[PDB]
DNA sequence: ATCAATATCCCGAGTACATGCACAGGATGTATATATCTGACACGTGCCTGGAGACTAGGGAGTAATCCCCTTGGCGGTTAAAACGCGGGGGACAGCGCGTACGTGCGTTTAAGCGGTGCTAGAGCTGTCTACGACCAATTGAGCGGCCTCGGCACCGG
């Protein structure tokens, strides 16, 4: 998702849900920003 | 936006070696005639180059974001240029002789001709079988993440 995020972008998303979110936990990795960028209304997640 | 100091061009005169022409001649260009095979012309032939159809898809044409190489401008250091004096070797004339071109004589050596015959060439279908297509598992490398240790600033102590 990371890498590929542009081809995300163009792409609108109705609903999205981040499966396992235990390693977002540090705000300064890309990964958090990346995630952040997204244009979605609803965000959900299942991490346990 | 000019005036001195050089350098160059123009013209005239004394001078000379090289151009241009005539002469004697000799050997190569020319006219005549013969032999003859190389190439113009005709014929058939069948290889293959040109035309069109349909389907696949690799490749080209169009667009958009952008980071990079290109180019302009500015400055410091120095490598070459311009001109002076100093110094040596290139440049201009006679004497030898050993090389190069003719002349003469000889024989070795290729061209030519004619049988003889292995021998390279072409299509034969021959069969293998390397090498081009497709798929898949090896290492190499960079972009990331977790944690620990070190160092600076704000808070409390004497």
Same mark, same amino acid.
């Given at each position: 998702?990371? /890498?590929?995020? @542009?081809?995300?972008?163009? &792409?609108? #998303?109705?609903?999205?849900?981040?499966?396992?979110? /235990?390693?977002? @936990?540090?705000?300064?990795? &890309?990964? #958090?920003?990346?995630?952040?960028?997204?244009?979605?209304?609803?965000?959900?997640?299942?991490?346990?």
């Amino acid at each position: 998702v990371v /890498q590929d995020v @542009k081809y995300f972008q163009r &792409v609108k #998303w109705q609903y999205m849900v981040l499966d396992e979110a /235990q390693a977002l @936990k540090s705000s300064s990795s &890309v990964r #958090w920003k990346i995630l952040l960028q997204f244009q979605c209304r609803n965000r959900l997640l299942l991490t346990g």
